[PDB]
Ligand binder design. Structure first.
Ligand code: HEM
Length: 154
């Protein structure tokens, strides 16, 4: 699939706001993911033991990982579709080291869209949400094809 330049502008316009508080957004997103789909928390051997949302908020480690994850996703969205290099090392680790099924990438996509809707309603109307959703669908599609080349799932 190919986004238009007007669709990438809606995605990078709301991302510019996210980047004013990277740690905050990375933390909200992971917590939302772990609350909504608790099974995903099991894939993190470093966080697995956190029992409540209050424990998750207080975790400095979780907050450091939210920064790492969001910064890597930002770098991919700023490429505007030309992200092949950035996707290779990410596909290799998530398929072979971490073993993250595509279904979980769909769950985190849902958590990203929930948090931006919540924190940025004026910049995340229907058209902006449709463009972000396309950008994450493009990312999931490319990653799924790389997973299949690497021998995982498909
Ligand atoms: C937009 C999607 C995602 C991005 C951009 C992202 C990026 C990252 C990055 C940059 C790292 C550190 C380097 C590496 O190991 O590759 C990482 C680590 C990891 N990721 Fe992801 N990731 C994504 C989705 C997920 C999903 C949905 C899960 C689990 C449900 C997941 C589980 C992990 C785990 C288990 C690690 C290791 C954490 C630790 O022990 O250090 N990732 N991820």
């Amino acid at each position: 699939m190919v986004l238009s330049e007007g669709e990438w502008q809606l995605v990078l316009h709301v991302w510019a706001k996210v980047e004013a508080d990277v740690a905050g957004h990375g933390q909200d997103i992971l917590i939302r993911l772990f609350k909504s789909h608790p099974e995903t928390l099991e894939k993190f051997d470093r966080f697995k033991h956190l029992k409540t949302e209050a424990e998750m908020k207080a975790s400095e480690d979780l907050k450091k990982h939210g920064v790492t994850f969001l910064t890597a996703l930002g770098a991919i969205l700023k490429k505007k579709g030309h992200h092949e290099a950035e996707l290779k090392p990410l596909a290799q680790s998530h398929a072979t080291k971490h073993k993250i099924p595509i279904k979980y990438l769909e769950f985190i996509s849902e958590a990203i869209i929930h948090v931006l809707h919540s924190r940025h309603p004026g910049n995340f109307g229907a058209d902006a949400q449709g463009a972000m959703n396309k950008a994450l669908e493009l990312f999931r599609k490319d990653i799924a094809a790389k997973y299949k080349e690497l021998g995982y799932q498909g």
